[PDB]
Amino acid sequence: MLIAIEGVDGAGKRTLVEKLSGAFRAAGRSVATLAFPRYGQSVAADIAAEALHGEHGDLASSVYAMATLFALDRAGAVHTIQGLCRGYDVVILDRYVASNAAYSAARLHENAAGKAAAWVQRIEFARLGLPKPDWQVLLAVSAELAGERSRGRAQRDPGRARDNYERDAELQQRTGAVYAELAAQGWGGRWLVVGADVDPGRLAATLAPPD
Amino acid sequence: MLIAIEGVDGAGKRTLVEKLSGAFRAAGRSVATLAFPRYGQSVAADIAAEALHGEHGDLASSVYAMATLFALDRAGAVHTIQGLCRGYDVVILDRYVASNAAYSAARLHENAAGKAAAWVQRIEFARLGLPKPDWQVLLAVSADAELQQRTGAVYAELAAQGWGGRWLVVGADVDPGRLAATLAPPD
Numbered sequence A: 001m002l003i004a005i006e007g008v009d010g011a012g013k014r015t016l017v018e019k020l021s022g023a024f025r026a027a028g029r030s031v032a033t034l035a036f037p038r039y040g041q042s043v044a045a046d047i048a049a050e051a052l053h054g055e056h057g058d059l060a061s062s063v064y065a066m067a068t069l070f071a072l073d074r075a076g077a078v079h080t081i082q083g084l085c086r087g088y089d090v091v092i093l094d095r096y097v098a099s100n101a102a103y104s105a106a107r108l109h110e111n112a113a114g115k116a117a118a119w120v121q122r123i124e125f126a127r128l129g130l131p132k133p134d135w136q137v138l139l140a141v142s143a144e145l146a147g148e149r150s151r152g153r154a155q156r157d158p159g160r161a162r163d164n165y166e167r168d169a170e171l172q173q174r175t176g177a178v179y180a181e182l183a184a185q186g187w188g189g190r191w192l193v194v195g196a197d198v199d200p201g202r203l204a205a206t207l208a209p210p211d
Numbered sequence B: 001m002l003i004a005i006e007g008v009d010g011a012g013k014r015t016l017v018e019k020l021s022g023a024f025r026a027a028g029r030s031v032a033t034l035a036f037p038r039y040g041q042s043v044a045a046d047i048a049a050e051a052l053h054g055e056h057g058d059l060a061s062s063v064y065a066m067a068t069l070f071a072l073d074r075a076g077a078v079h080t081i082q083g084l085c086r087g088y089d090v091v092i093l094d095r096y097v098a099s100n101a102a103y104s105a106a107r108l109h110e111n112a113a114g115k116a117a118a119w120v121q122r123i124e125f126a127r128l129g130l131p132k133p134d135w136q137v138l139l140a141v142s143a144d145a146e147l148q149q150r151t152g153a154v155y156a157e158l159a160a161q162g163w164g165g166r167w168l169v170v171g172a173d174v175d176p177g178r179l180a181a182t183l184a185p186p187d
């Protein structure tokens, strides 16, 4: 079973990955986890990170160029995703294809029914052959909490160096709304929308009901 | 020996590559050639091709995004270039890193000493470790028009300045035997 955890930066995605991992293992299921982008393991992801911190000229301002880099990074991980799914009962991804649909649409002021989200689905699922997740779990938290926890688009920089607090906060709002539309329409498969305090045992039971 | 053929007239480059290949082989040297971008053989190059035909949203309007795809195409080709050099006396590349410097600078209205050409050198040679060629041969006299003119002028300064290594600047009708003898002089 392949599960993707989705949401805006600062939602607490990794915390959920860990507690869900613990709940599955308590129920006798083996679990492996993987986070995107895969820094150090593709040129594409490293260039994207550098672009977010101001390198590479006008690269980051092209929404489709950044999205292409994140897709190429995932394409490089297909054998890992498939190998983990062979060796483990449950594979949990921190961010996956829907991240690309949500942020790209939001950067372009589009909704989930728009061109960017359709382009993401075509290029990643159809053209590059990424496996579809069995579940996509949207971790939806308050805009305020996400704003305080997010490190912004330049996540290497110390907090004292953030100066785009407004652009990033507006983008996160739009991205949250696209995510919600993605979940409502079953984009790429089944979705569940959960909060920060979701019980891990009961969440694991819902995602993989016992036989 | 690793040789890159450069210029704005690609139909002329291809003829030059063929005539040069024959001259090397006539001199007892085995030759392999490889063309960039590797259209039909890498996703990065194919996405770039599609972007030039209007696909992929705003991608083609970013000079650095397109340049990045061509760099990723070459980054994926390191073992091919290196393996060819290990298996053949002469490896001739039809377009190489300097193509990225010249076209990117020209699209941005910069010259050979500007930011884009420096960025190309830093990312492709210093960071991704593409092999430095023994020769870059600029085809400068052949047998968007303004963009082509600007690309030609950047090319000429790149060669004059030794960008990325040694350059030779030639016309199309240069004697292939002498050109082959110049690039890999017989013993």
Ligand SMILES: Cc1cn(C2CCN(Cc3cccc(Oc4ccccc4)n3)CC2)c(=O)[nH]c1=O
Binding pocket: A009, A036, A037, A052, A060, A066, A067, A070, A071, A095, A096, A097, A099, A100, A103, A104, A150, A152, A153, A154, A168, A171
């Ligand atoms: C794995 C993944 C991730 N992302 C983004 C997730 C958020 N992260 C940090 C962030 C936090 C706040 C604002 C912001 O603005 C962006 C987002 C995308 C591109 C450029 C700027 N970016 C950048 C990559 C994406 O766009 N597509 C993906 O496929």
Ligand SMILES: Cc1cn(C2CCN(Cc3cccc(Oc4ccccc4)n3)CC2)c(=O)[nH]c1=O
Binding pocket: B036, B037, B052, B060, B066, B067, B070, B071, B095, B096, B097, B099, B100, B101, B103, B104, B144, B147
């Ligand atoms: C191998 C290589 C090649 N090129 C270009 C060579 C010319 N080719 C076709 C062409 C012919 C005439 C104008 C033009 O303008 C461009 C160039 C780059 C990007 C967009 C448009 N493009 C596009 C790729 C490049 O920019 N970087 C490279 O690394």
Ligand SMILES: [Cl-]
Binding pocket: A008, A009, A010, A011, A012, A013, A014
């Ligand atoms: Cl998070």
Ligand SMILES: [Cl-]
Binding pocket: A025, A029, A030, A031, A032
């Ligand atoms: Cl386990």
Ligand SMILES: [Cl-]
Binding pocket: A049, A155, A156
């Ligand atoms: Cl980073």
Ligand SMILES: [Cl-]
Binding pocket: A054, A055, A056, A057, B119
């Ligand atoms: Cl840079």
Ligand SMILES: [Cl-]
Binding pocket: A107, A171
């Ligand atoms: Cl933006």
Ligand SMILES: [Cl-]
Binding pocket: B001, B002, B085, B086
């Ligand atoms: Cl060699």
Ligand SMILES: [Cl-]
Binding pocket: B141, B170, B171, B172, B173, B174
């Ligand atoms: Cl001549």
